[PDB]
C-alpha cells in the first residue's frame, strides 16, 4: 500500500518493537518543518494578556476509513490558521501527530503534541494497560517513555498530552511512578537532544485514582510539583466544571508549590458547547479589569467545522471564535454577545521574524490550486503541510468612513488555494487601512518587497510598513504605491532606503476619491526578503513506487533531494500539452493519489515534475521524471 497512514499501536508490545524507518510510510509521516521562533508584538487589545495562554485539543483529521495522513483530494478540512493565538496544538486523535499538522504548526512557530490517552475505565484490562506503560528496567528507567521520546524526535513533534482517565485498585498506588515517568522522559529527551514538554489532564489524582478537581488542588498538585529545577507536567488542563472558588483555589495551589498559575489551562467543553456558542463562566476567570486570571484549554474546537456547510464557512466561524463578534482584534466584545474572541483576551505572536518573510495566504486547502494567478489544479484539496502564515489580525481596520469587507477568496488566488479579497460598495470619498501582520524584519541594502495583487479599479492602493514596535506608520520611506490593473501582477520595490531599520507591521491603505459600486482589490502574495534568487532545483527525482488502477489512473510515490532554501515542493503531471499541479508538501517524499491520463493520451509514459518554492517565495527550475504506465490508453 502506497497511501501514507496515521501511526497507531494495538499494544505496548507493538510500541516496544518500533524502530526509526521500519515502516513503509515513515519517509512521508515524518514532520519536515523545524519549529519556528516567534515574537510577541505590542499588545493591540486593552483587555488582552501576555501571561494568558491557549492550548487547543483538536481532532485534526478526517475520520473517513481510508484517509491519508497527509490530507486528501477534498476541500473541507480543519485547515487551522489561527496559530498566532496558540501556545500549542494537541493532536487529540492519537499518539503520533500527522505530518500535515506538524508542518503547519511548526511553520507558524506552534509546538505540536501527541496524545497518550488511558481509557475512562476501571476494567482490569485498562488498569493493566496503564500499569504496563509504567514498567521500569533494572535502573528505574521507563522503556515506554523512551519509545515515546524516540518517536517525538524521529517524526519531529514536541511532546505529549496525557489524559489518564483509568481508575481502580491497581491504579491508585501509581501516582509517584506516573510522576517519575514524566520526569524520566524529559531527562532522556534532553539526553537525545530533543526536549519535550508534557501536558496533563485533571483526572488521575496522586493517591486516590480518578477524581476531577476542575482545577489544581490538594489531590493533584504533585503532578505540577517542582523537582529541583525540573517539573513533571509543564501544562495542566483543568476539568470543565470550574467556578470562582475553584479558580481561586487553583491560583493559590499553583502559587504555593512555586508554579505559574498560567500553566493551568481552564477547560472549555466546545464539543458539548458548540464552539463559540459554548456558555462559559467568564465572570469566574476574568479579573476586575476584564483580564484572564488563568490560561484557556480548548476542548474539541475542531467541532466548529460542523457549524457551517462549506470550507469558506470554516474560516468565517473561526473568525468569530478567535477574533470575536466585533470582527477586529482591537475591539471589545459587543454588548449583545456573551462569547469573547480569543484576541479580546490573549496577545498575538508572529513567526514573521528575521530577514525574510513570505506568504501567499495558503490556508492548507482549496477548491483549486493557482500558480502565479492561473489555475493549475482544477479541483479540491487539503494538504496542510503547505499551510503558510496568514494575517496576525483578522481584521484590524480604520476608516474616515465605511470599511471594506475583508475575506479569504477561494475563487481566485495568486499561489495556492486562496487570496485575500477587499470589497464593498464605496459610498464616497474615503481613506482606510487594513493592518495585516505583526513582524520583526531586519532591512538591509539588499531588502526588497514583492507584492502580487489584482483589481483596485476606482482607487489608489498602497502598502505601508511600521518601523517602530508600537505600530506607527509615520515613516515616509515605508510607503509604496501599487500599480493597479485588472489582472494579477507581481511587483518588486526596493527597500534599501530603510536599511538598518526594522519592520514591525504591514498594512494596506486605500484611497477612493468618490463612490465606487462593486469595488474589489485582491492581495495574492507578500514577500519581504534580502534574497531574490531562485532556490536550487530538486535533484535525484524519481517515481519510487506505483500502483495502477487502470491505463488512465495510478497512485504513486515520488522522492527527490531538496535544499535548505526550499519552504515546500509542488508536484505536477503533464496532461497532454499542459502541466497541472497534483499536490504540494514540505517533505521530499510525496504521495500522489491520482496520476492520470486522458482518453487521447499518446504512448505508454507520462512526464512529472517537482519544483521547490523558496522561503523567499521564488520557485526553482523544475526537475522532471517519467512515469511509466507500461501500456497505452486504448
PDB file of N, CA and C in Angstrom, residues 249-342:
ATOM      1  N   UNK A 249      -8.766  28.664  44.179  1.00  0.00           N
ATOM      2  CA  UNK A 249      -8.044  27.524  44.760  1.00  0.00           C
ATOM      3  C   UNK A 249      -6.893  27.088  43.862  1.00  0.00           C
ATOM      4  N   UNK A 250      -7.147  27.081  42.562  1.00  0.00           N
ATOM      5  CA  UNK A 250      -6.105  26.748  41.592  1.00  0.00           C
ATOM      6  C   UNK A 250      -4.911  27.696  41.681  1.00  0.00           C
ATOM      7  N   UNK A 251      -5.206  28.988  41.642  1.00  0.00           N
ATOM      8  CA  UNK A 251      -4.196  30.038  41.738  1.00  0.00           C
ATOM      9  C   UNK A 251      -3.426  29.921  43.050  1.00  0.00           C
ATOM     10  N   UNK A 252      -4.143  29.745  44.162  1.00  0.00           N
ATOM     11  CA  UNK A 252      -3.491  29.581  45.463  1.00  0.00           C
ATOM     12  C   UNK A 252      -2.562  28.350  45.476  1.00  0.00           C
ATOM     13  N   UNK A 253      -3.010  27.246  44.881  1.00  0.00           N
ATOM     14  CA  UNK A 253      -2.244  25.996  44.928  1.00  0.00           C
ATOM     15  C   UNK A 253      -0.981  26.137  44.071  1.00  0.00           C
ATOM     16  N   UNK A 254      -1.140  26.692  42.859  1.00  0.00           N
ATOM     17  CA  UNK A 254      -0.012  26.914  41.936  1.00  0.00           C
ATOM     18  C   UNK A 254       1.018  27.789  42.632  1.00  0.00           C
ATOM     19  N   UNK A 255       0.552  28.882  43.241  1.00  0.00           N
ATOM     20  CA  UNK A 255       1.478  29.804  43.892  1.00  0.00           C
ATOM     21  C   UNK A 255       2.233  29.127  45.034  1.00  0.00           C
ATOM     22  N   UNK A 256       1.508  28.347  45.835  1.00  0.00           N
ATOM     23  CA  UNK A 256       2.127  27.682  46.989  1.00  0.00           C
ATOM     24  C   UNK A 256       3.230  26.701  46.603  1.00  0.00           C
ATOM     25  N   UNK A 257       3.027  25.939  45.528  1.00  0.00           N
ATOM     26  CA  UNK A 257       4.038  24.983  45.067  1.00  0.00           C
ATOM     27  C   UNK A 257       5.154  25.589  44.177  1.00  0.00           C
ATOM     28  N   UNK A 258       5.030  26.877  43.865  1.00  0.00           N
ATOM     29  CA  UNK A 258       6.002  27.592  43.070  1.00  0.00           C
ATOM     30  C   UNK A 258       5.838  27.353  41.589  1.00  0.00           C
ATOM     31  N   UNK A 259       4.588  27.291  41.119  1.00  0.00           N
ATOM     32  CA  UNK A 259       4.316  27.230  39.669  1.00  0.00           C
ATOM     33  C   UNK A 259       3.553  28.477  39.218  1.00  0.00           C
ATOM     34  N   UNK A 260       3.754  28.856  37.960  1.00  0.00           N
ATOM     35  CA  UNK A 260       2.992  29.917  37.358  1.00  0.00           C
ATOM     36  C   UNK A 260       1.535  29.461  37.180  1.00  0.00           C
ATOM     37  N   UNK A 261       0.581  30.184  37.792  1.00  0.00           N
ATOM     38  CA  UNK A 261      -0.840  29.864  37.596  1.00  0.00           C
ATOM     39  C   UNK A 261      -1.259  29.762  36.123  1.00  0.00           C
ATOM     40  N   UNK A 262      -0.577  30.503  35.257  1.00  0.00           N
ATOM     41  CA  UNK A 262      -0.871  30.439  33.810  1.00  0.00           C
ATOM     42  C   UNK A 262      -0.430  29.149  33.086  1.00  0.00           C
ATOM     43  N   UNK A 263       0.276  28.272  33.800  1.00  0.00           N
ATOM     44  CA  UNK A 263       0.497  26.917  33.289  1.00  0.00           C
ATOM     45  C   UNK A 263      -0.725  26.011  33.477  1.00  0.00           C
ATOM     46  N   UNK A 264      -1.758  26.535  34.126  1.00  0.00           N
ATOM     47  CA  UNK A 264      -3.053  25.859  34.239  1.00  0.00           C
ATOM     48  C   UNK A 264      -4.008  26.473  33.211  1.00  0.00           C
ATOM     49  N   UNK A 265      -4.580  25.577  32.402  1.00  0.00           N
ATOM     50  CA  UNK A 265      -5.455  25.865  31.290  1.00  0.00           C
ATOM     51  C   UNK A 265      -6.860  25.398  31.658  1.00  0.00           C
ATOM     52  N   UNK A 266      -7.721  26.375  31.949  1.00  0.00           N
ATOM     53  CA  UNK A 266      -9.104  26.103  32.309  1.00  0.00           C
ATOM     54  C   UNK A 266      -9.891  25.558  31.090  1.00  0.00           C
ATOM     55  N   UNK A 267     -10.397  24.351  31.236  1.00  0.00           N
ATOM     56  CA  UNK A 267     -11.038  23.684  30.112  1.00  0.00           C
ATOM     57  C   UNK A 267     -12.333  24.327  29.664  1.00  0.00           C
ATOM     58  N   UNK A 268     -12.493  24.445  28.346  1.00  0.00           N
ATOM     59  CA  UNK A 268     -13.784  24.821  27.712  1.00  0.00           C
ATOM     60  C   UNK A 268     -14.317  23.635  26.891  1.00  0.00           C
ATOM     61  N   UNK A 269     -15.527  23.168  27.216  1.00  0.00           N
ATOM     62  CA  UNK A 269     -16.102  21.974  26.572  1.00  0.00           C
ATOM     63  C   UNK A 269     -16.824  22.443  25.300  1.00  0.00           C
ATOM     64  N   UNK A 270     -16.073  22.533  24.204  1.00  0.00           N
ATOM     65  CA  UNK A 270     -16.571  23.188  22.974  1.00  0.00           C
ATOM     66  C   UNK A 270     -17.358  22.229  22.081  1.00  0.00           C
ATOM     67  N   UNK A 271     -17.247  20.941  22.404  1.00  0.00           N
ATOM     68  CA  UNK A 271     -17.970  19.906  21.694  1.00  0.00           C
ATOM     69  C   UNK A 271     -19.421  19.889  22.168  1.00  0.00           C
ATOM     70  N   UNK A 272     -19.631  19.672  23.464  1.00  0.00           N
ATOM     71  CA  UNK A 272     -20.980  19.815  24.007  1.00  0.00           C
ATOM     72  C   UNK A 272     -21.493  21.263  23.944  1.00  0.00           C
ATOM     73  N   UNK A 273     -20.569  22.236  23.922  1.00  0.00           N
ATOM     74  CA  UNK A 273     -20.937  23.653  23.886  1.00  0.00           C
ATOM     75  C   UNK A 273     -21.333  24.209  22.513  1.00  0.00           C
ATOM     76  N   UNK A 274     -20.766  23.651  21.443  1.00  0.00           N
ATOM     77  CA  UNK A 274     -20.970  24.193  20.097  1.00  0.00           C
ATOM     78  C   UNK A 274     -20.031  25.343  19.766  1.00  0.00           C
ATOM     79  N   UNK A 275     -18.732  25.143  20.011  1.00  0.00           N
ATOM     80  CA  UNK A 275     -17.709  26.169  19.665  1.00  0.00           C
ATOM     81  C   UNK A 275     -17.964  27.512  20.405  1.00  0.00           C
ATOM     82  N   UNK A 276     -18.080  28.631  19.665  1.00  0.00           N
ATOM     83  CA  UNK A 276     -18.263  29.958  20.283  1.00  0.00           C
ATOM     84  C   UNK A 276     -19.671  30.148  20.883  1.00  0.00           C
ATOM     85  N   UNK A 277     -20.556  29.166  20.687  1.00  0.00           N
ATOM     86  CA  UNK A 277     -21.848  29.131  21.402  1.00  0.00           C
ATOM     87  C   UNK A 277     -21.746  28.522  22.803  1.00  0.00           C
ATOM     88  N   UNK A 278     -20.567  28.016  23.165  1.00  0.00           N
ATOM     89  CA  UNK A 278     -20.351  27.420  24.496  1.00  0.00           C
ATOM     90  C   UNK A 278     -20.571  28.449  25.619  1.00  0.00           C
ATOM     91  N   UNK A 279     -21.424  28.105  26.591  1.00  0.00           N
ATOM     92  CA  UNK A 279     -21.791  29.011  27.698  1.00  0.00           C
ATOM     93  C   UNK A 279     -20.717  29.056  28.807  1.00  0.00           C
ATOM     94  N   UNK A 280     -19.649  29.815  28.578  1.00  0.00           N
ATOM     95  CA  UNK A 280     -18.522  29.924  29.515  1.00  0.00           C
ATOM     96  C   UNK A 280     -18.753  30.871  30.713  1.00  0.00           C
ATOM     97  N   UNK A 281     -18.378  30.433  31.919  1.00  0.00           N
ATOM     98  CA  UNK A 281     -18.450  31.289  33.098  1.00  0.00           C
ATOM     99  C   UNK A 281     -17.344  32.349  33.127  1.00  0.00           C
ATOM    100  N   UNK A 282     -17.360  33.243  32.139  1.00  0.00           N
ATOM    101  CA  UNK A 282     -16.345  34.300  32.041  1.00  0.00           C
ATOM    102  C   UNK A 282     -16.144  35.069  33.330  1.00  0.00           C
ATOM    103  N   UNK A 283     -17.231  35.329  34.056  1.00  0.00           N
ATOM    104  CA  UNK A 283     -17.163  36.073  35.328  1.00  0.00           C
ATOM    105  C   UNK A 283     -16.251  35.405  36.393  1.00  0.00           C
ATOM    106  N   UNK A 284     -15.976  34.120  36.204  1.00  0.00           N
ATOM    107  CA  UNK A 284     -15.199  33.350  37.164  1.00  0.00           C
ATOM    108  C   UNK A 284     -13.705  33.281  36.836  1.00  0.00           C
ATOM    109  N   UNK A 285     -13.355  33.692  35.620  1.00  0.00           N
ATOM    110  CA  UNK A 285     -11.996  33.568  35.127  1.00  0.00           C
ATOM    111  C   UNK A 285     -11.375  34.920  34.701  1.00  0.00           C
ATOM    112  N   UNK A 286     -12.227  35.928  34.497  1.00  0.00           N
ATOM    113  CA  UNK A 286     -11.759  37.297  34.251  1.00  0.00           C
ATOM    114  C   UNK A 286     -11.702  38.060  35.553  1.00  0.00           C
ATOM    115  N   UNK A 287     -10.624  38.822  35.747  1.00  0.00           N
ATOM    116  CA  UNK A 287     -10.453  39.642  36.948  1.00  0.00           C
ATOM    117  C   UNK A 287     -11.282  40.942  36.859  1.00  0.00           C
ATOM    118  N   UNK A 288     -11.035  41.875  37.784  1.00  0.00           N
ATOM    119  CA  UNK A 288     -11.803  43.121  37.862  1.00  0.00           C
ATOM    120  C   UNK A 288     -11.602  43.989  36.605  1.00  0.00           C
ATOM    121  N   UNK A 289     -10.429  43.848  35.968  1.00  0.00           N
ATOM    122  CA  UNK A 289     -10.055  44.611  34.771  1.00  0.00           C
ATOM    123  C   UNK A 289     -10.494  43.967  33.464  1.00  0.00           C
ATOM    124  N   UNK A 290     -11.249  42.871  33.554  1.00  0.00           N
ATOM    125  CA  UNK A 290     -11.706  42.156  32.371  1.00  0.00           C
ATOM    126  C   UNK A 290     -10.632  41.251  31.787  1.00  0.00           C
ATOM    127  N   UNK A 291      -9.634  40.898  32.598  1.00  0.00           N
ATOM    128  CA  UNK A 291      -8.468  40.129  32.126  1.00  0.00           C
ATOM    129  C   UNK A 291      -8.340  38.714  32.710  1.00  0.00           C
ATOM    130  N   UNK A 292      -7.864  37.785  31.880  1.00  0.00           N
ATOM    131  CA  UNK A 292      -7.803  36.362  32.245  1.00  0.00           C
ATOM    132  C   UNK A 292      -6.898  36.146  33.459  1.00  0.00           C
ATOM    133  N   UNK A 293      -7.380  35.371  34.427  1.00  0.00           N
ATOM    134  CA  UNK A 293      -6.605  35.000  35.604  1.00  0.00           C
ATOM    135  C   UNK A 293      -6.002  33.600  35.463  1.00  0.00           C
ATOM    136  N   UNK A 294      -6.439  32.863  34.435  1.00  0.00           N
ATOM    137  CA  UNK A 294      -5.882  31.551  34.094  1.00  0.00           C
ATOM    138  C   UNK A 294      -5.751  31.450  32.584  1.00  0.00           C
ATOM    139  N   UNK A 295      -5.119  30.375  32.131  1.00  0.00           N
ATOM    140  CA  UNK A 295      -4.999  30.151  30.708  1.00  0.00           C
ATOM    141  C   UNK A 295      -6.267  29.396  30.267  1.00  0.00           C
ATOM    142  N   UNK A 296      -6.402  29.199  28.964  1.00  0.00           N
ATOM    143  CA  UNK A 296      -7.602  28.594  28.395  1.00  0.00           C
ATOM    144  C   UNK A 296      -7.289  27.314  27.632  1.00  0.00           C
ATOM    145  N   UNK A 297      -8.002  26.249  27.997  1.00  0.00           N
ATOM    146  CA  UNK A 297      -7.948  24.966  27.317  1.00  0.00           C
ATOM    147  C   UNK A 297      -9.130  24.745  26.409  1.00  0.00           C
ATOM    148  N   UNK A 298      -8.881  24.649  25.099  1.00  0.00           N
ATOM    149  CA  UNK A 298      -9.991  24.477  24.130  1.00  0.00           C
ATOM    150  C   UNK A 298     -10.187  23.004  23.839  1.00  0.00           C
ATOM    151  N   UNK A 299     -11.277  22.436  24.349  1.00  0.00           N
ATOM    152  CA  UNK A 299     -11.536  21.025  24.086  1.00  0.00           C
ATOM    153  C   UNK A 299     -12.378  20.871  22.812  1.00  0.00           C
ATOM    154  N   UNK A 300     -11.841  20.114  21.849  1.00  0.00           N
ATOM    155  CA  UNK A 300     -12.504  19.809  20.572  1.00  0.00           C
ATOM    156  C   UNK A 300     -12.991  21.065  19.831  1.00  0.00           C
ATOM    157  N   UNK A 301     -12.100  22.083  19.646  1.00  0.00           N
ATOM    158  CA  UNK A 301     -12.516  23.289  18.890  1.00  0.00           C
ATOM    159  C   UNK A 301     -12.792  22.988  17.393  1.00  0.00           C
ATOM    160  N   UNK A 302     -12.166  21.922  16.875  1.00  0.00           N
ATOM    161  CA  UNK A 302     -12.449  21.393  15.523  1.00  0.00           C
ATOM    162  C   UNK A 302     -13.954  21.143  15.274  1.00  0.00           C
ATOM    163  N   UNK A 303     -14.722  21.008  16.369  1.00  0.00           N
ATOM    164  CA  UNK A 303     -16.197  21.000  16.373  1.00  0.00           C
ATOM    165  C   UNK A 303     -16.785  22.102  15.485  1.00  0.00           C
ATOM    166  N   UNK A 304     -16.078  23.233  15.401  1.00  0.00           N
ATOM    167  CA  UNK A 304     -16.518  24.408  14.633  1.00  0.00           C
ATOM    168  C   UNK A 304     -16.749  24.143  13.129  1.00  0.00           C
ATOM    169  N   UNK A 305     -16.065  23.132  12.579  1.00  0.00           N
ATOM    170  CA  UNK A 305     -16.271  22.728  11.172  1.00  0.00           C
ATOM    171  C   UNK A 305     -17.716  22.250  10.914  1.00  0.00           C
ATOM    172  N   UNK A 306     -18.394  21.796  11.969  1.00  0.00           N
ATOM    173  CA  UNK A 306     -19.751  21.314  11.813  1.00  0.00           C
ATOM    174  C   UNK A 306     -20.792  22.453  11.900  1.00  0.00           C
ATOM    175  N   UNK A 307     -20.360  23.669  12.255  1.00  0.00           N
ATOM    176  CA  UNK A 307     -21.286  24.823  12.334  1.00  0.00           C
ATOM    177  C   UNK A 307     -21.667  25.415  10.966  1.00  0.00           C
ATOM    178  N   UNK A 308     -20.862  25.153   9.942  1.00  0.00           N
ATOM    179  CA  UNK A 308     -21.104  25.690   8.602  1.00  0.00           C
ATOM    180  C   UNK A 308     -20.945  24.646   7.502  1.00  0.00           C
ATOM    181  N   UNK A 309     -21.704  24.814   6.434  1.00  0.00           N
ATOM    182  CA  UNK A 309     -21.759  23.804   5.382  1.00  0.00           C
ATOM    183  C   UNK A 309     -20.491  23.768   4.500  1.00  0.00           C
ATOM    184  N   UNK A 310     -19.772  24.894   4.394  1.00  0.00           N
ATOM    185  CA  UNK A 310     -18.634  24.975   3.451  1.00  0.00           C
ATOM    186  C   UNK A 310     -17.261  25.213   4.080  1.00  0.00           C
ATOM    187  N   UNK A 311     -16.204  24.984   3.301  1.00  0.00           N
ATOM    188  CA  UNK A 311     -14.838  25.375   3.702  1.00  0.00           C
ATOM    189  C   UNK A 311     -14.670  26.862   4.000  1.00  0.00           C
ATOM    190  N   UNK A 312     -15.320  27.704   3.182  1.00  0.00           N
ATOM    191  CA  UNK A 312     -15.409  29.151   3.422  1.00  0.00           C
ATOM    192  C   UNK A 312     -16.040  29.491   4.796  1.00  0.00           C
ATOM    193  N   UNK A 313     -17.109  28.766   5.153  1.00  0.00           N
ATOM    194  CA  UNK A 313     -17.775  28.906   6.467  1.00  0.00           C
ATOM    195  C   UNK A 313     -16.811  28.611   7.635  1.00  0.00           C
ATOM    196  N   UNK A 314     -15.904  27.625   7.444  1.00  0.00           N
ATOM    197  CA  UNK A 314     -14.944  27.217   8.480  1.00  0.00           C
ATOM    198  C   UNK A 314     -14.178  28.457   8.959  1.00  0.00           C
ATOM    199  N   UNK A 315     -13.620  29.194   8.001  1.00  0.00           N
ATOM    200  CA  UNK A 315     -12.793  30.335   8.321  1.00  0.00           C
ATOM    201  C   UNK A 315     -13.599  31.484   8.951  1.00  0.00           C
ATOM    202  N   UNK A 316     -14.798  31.721   8.433  1.00  0.00           N
ATOM    203  CA  UNK A 316     -15.669  32.767   8.978  1.00  0.00           C
ATOM    204  C   UNK A 316     -16.097  32.497  10.433  1.00  0.00           C
ATOM    205  N   UNK A 317     -16.371  31.239  10.745  1.00  0.00           N
ATOM    206  CA  UNK A 317     -16.677  30.816  12.110  1.00  0.00           C
ATOM    207  C   UNK A 317     -15.459  30.847  13.040  1.00  0.00           C
ATOM    208  N   UNK A 318     -14.307  30.408  12.530  1.00  0.00           N
ATOM    209  CA  UNK A 318     -13.047  30.616  13.277  1.00  0.00           C
ATOM    210  C   UNK A 318     -12.779  32.079  13.614  1.00  0.00           C
ATOM    211  N   UNK A 319     -13.099  32.986  12.690  1.00  0.00           N
ATOM    212  CA  UNK A 319     -13.041  34.407  12.979  1.00  0.00           C
ATOM    213  C   UNK A 319     -13.836  34.781  14.211  1.00  0.00           C
ATOM    214  N   UNK A 320     -15.072  34.291  14.313  1.00  0.00           N
ATOM    215  CA  UNK A 320     -15.917  34.609  15.483  1.00  0.00           C
ATOM    216  C   UNK A 320     -15.257  34.045  16.740  1.00  0.00           C
ATOM    217  N   UNK A 321     -14.764  32.806  16.659  1.00  0.00           N
ATOM    218  CA  UNK A 321     -14.128  32.198  17.803  1.00  0.00           C
ATOM    219  C   UNK A 321     -12.858  32.950  18.227  1.00  0.00           C
ATOM    220  N   UNK A 322     -11.929  33.139  17.291  1.00  0.00           N
ATOM    221  CA  UNK A 322     -10.604  33.665  17.664  1.00  0.00           C
ATOM    222  C   UNK A 322     -10.440  35.187  17.688  1.00  0.00           C
ATOM    223  N   UNK A 323     -11.242  35.899  16.905  1.00  0.00           N
ATOM    224  CA  UNK A 323     -11.141  37.355  16.901  1.00  0.00           C
ATOM    225  C   UNK A 323     -12.320  37.892  17.713  1.00  0.00           C
ATOM    226  N   UNK A 324     -13.507  37.315  17.501  1.00  0.00           N
ATOM    227  CA  UNK A 324     -14.677  37.720  18.255  1.00  0.00           C
ATOM    228  C   UNK A 324     -15.743  38.307  17.355  1.00  0.00           C
ATOM    229  N   UNK A 325     -16.930  38.503  17.913  1.00  0.00           N
ATOM    230  CA  UNK A 325     -18.055  39.050  17.137  1.00  0.00           C
ATOM    231  C   UNK A 325     -17.839  40.483  16.631  1.00  0.00           C
ATOM    232  N   UNK A 326     -17.073  41.307  17.357  1.00  0.00           N
ATOM    233  CA  UNK A 326     -16.771  42.674  16.907  1.00  0.00           C
ATOM    234  C   UNK A 326     -15.920  42.686  15.597  1.00  0.00           C
ATOM    235  N   UNK A 327     -15.209  41.593  15.292  1.00  0.00           N
ATOM    236  CA  UNK A 327     -14.570  41.433  13.966  1.00  0.00           C
ATOM    237  C   UNK A 327     -13.244  42.126  13.780  1.00  0.00           C
ATOM    238  N   UNK A 328     -12.720  42.683  14.865  1.00  0.00           N
ATOM    239  CA  UNK A 328     -11.462  43.428  14.865  1.00  0.00           C
ATOM    240  C   UNK A 328     -10.750  43.089  16.191  1.00  0.00           C
ATOM    241  N   UNK A 329      -9.509  42.529  16.138  1.00  0.00           N
ATOM    242  CA  UNK A 329      -8.841  42.086  17.389  1.00  0.00           C
ATOM    243  C   UNK A 329      -8.532  43.242  18.346  1.00  0.00           C
ATOM    244  N   UNK A 330      -8.673  44.475  17.863  1.00  0.00           N
ATOM    245  CA  UNK A 330      -8.520  45.640  18.721  1.00  0.00           C
ATOM    246  C   UNK A 330      -9.811  46.038  19.423  1.00  0.00           C
ATOM    247  N   UNK A 331     -10.927  45.417  19.056  1.00  0.00           N
ATOM    248  CA  UNK A 331     -12.216  45.828  19.601  1.00  0.00           C
ATOM    249  C   UNK A 331     -12.645  44.981  20.793  1.00  0.00           C
ATOM    250  N   UNK A 332     -13.696  45.438  21.481  1.00  0.00           N
ATOM    251  CA  UNK A 332     -14.238  44.737  22.656  1.00  0.00           C
ATOM    252  C   UNK A 332     -15.434  43.957  22.233  1.00  0.00           C
ATOM    253  N   UNK A 333     -15.687  42.854  22.938  1.00  0.00           N
ATOM    254  CA  UNK A 333     -16.889  42.055  22.788  1.00  0.00           C
ATOM    255  C   UNK A 333     -18.141  42.980  22.672  1.00  0.00           C
ATOM    256  N   UNK A 334     -19.033  42.731  21.684  1.00  0.00           N
ATOM    257  CA  UNK A 334     -20.279  43.510  21.596  1.00  0.00           C
ATOM    258  C   UNK A 334     -21.181  43.310  22.824  1.00  0.00           C
ATOM    259  N   UNK A 335     -21.911  44.374  23.176  1.00  0.00           N
ATOM    260  CA  UNK A 335     -22.808  44.348  24.335  1.00  0.00           C
ATOM    261  C   UNK A 335     -23.892  43.284  24.281  1.00  0.00           C
ATOM    262  N   UNK A 336     -24.233  42.843  23.075  1.00  0.00           N
ATOM    263  CA  UNK A 336     -25.299  41.859  22.915  1.00  0.00           C
ATOM    264  C   UNK A 336     -24.807  40.410  22.776  1.00  0.00           C
ATOM    265  N   UNK A 337     -23.516  40.187  23.029  1.00  0.00           N
ATOM    266  CA  UNK A 337     -22.904  38.857  22.931  1.00  0.00           C
ATOM    267  C   UNK A 337     -22.353  38.403  24.265  1.00  0.00           C
ATOM    268  N   UNK A 338     -22.265  37.085  24.442  1.00  0.00           N
ATOM    269  CA  UNK A 338     -21.597  36.516  25.630  1.00  0.00           C
ATOM    270  C   UNK A 338     -20.180  36.012  25.394  1.00  0.00           C
ATOM    271  N   UNK A 339     -19.911  35.538  24.180  1.00  0.00           N
ATOM    272  CA  UNK A 339     -18.601  34.975  23.802  1.00  0.00           C
ATOM    273  C   UNK A 339     -17.581  36.085  23.666  1.00  0.00           C
ATOM    274  N   UNK A 340     -16.387  35.934  24.286  1.00  0.00           N
ATOM    275  CA  UNK A 340     -15.241  36.780  23.976  1.00  0.00           C
ATOM    276  C   UNK A 340     -14.352  36.102  22.945  1.00  0.00           C
ATOM    277  N   UNK A 341     -13.977  36.835  21.898  1.00  0.00           N
ATOM    278  CA  UNK A 341     -12.986  36.326  20.959  1.00  0.00           C
ATOM    279  C   UNK A 341     -11.681  36.113  21.709  1.00  0.00           C
ATOM    280  N   UNK A 342     -10.917  35.099  21.328  1.00  0.00           N
ATOM    281  CA  UNK A 342      -9.615  34.876  21.971  1.00  0.00           C
ATOM    282  C   UNK A 342      -8.727  36.123  21.895  1.00  0.00           C
TER     283      UNK A 342
END
